[PDB]
Amino acid sequence: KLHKEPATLIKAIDGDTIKIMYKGQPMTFRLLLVDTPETKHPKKGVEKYGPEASAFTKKMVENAKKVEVEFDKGQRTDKYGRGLAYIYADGKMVNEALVRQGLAKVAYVYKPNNTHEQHLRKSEAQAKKEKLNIWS
């Protein structure tokens, strides 16, 4: 049974990466299960809808009263030392909102970190049917 923990926004870095104060330490978090187009991508640089995905995440977490982190059941950091979690802004999952808006695709999924996978794929299929953004 996953649980949400309180956290404090430090800085939004990209569509799918946010810096957060967690249990009193600054950490970089990568959003589980979603790929957004990047502004800070290794190879390509600024890909299409990258600035848009990035502004969406930033506004969403910046305007929130409460930010919460929810770890999944498997590893909680990746090889870059980034936390792996679902992020909530006033009760709303940022990972899903991005997917629902056609601003992210559901990522390659790795068990056992796949608890909300079905839910996200359902939102992804709706944004495609609606031909939003990435899917337009």
From Swiss-Prot:
Bias kind Basic and acidic residues: ranges: 116-132
Name of the protein in its database record: Nuclease A
Binding positions for Ca(2+) per the UniProt entry: 16, 35-36
Location(s), subcellular: Secreted
Ranges for region Disordered: 116-136
Residue numbers annotated as active site: 30, 38, 82
Part of the full-length chain shown: 88 to 223 of 231
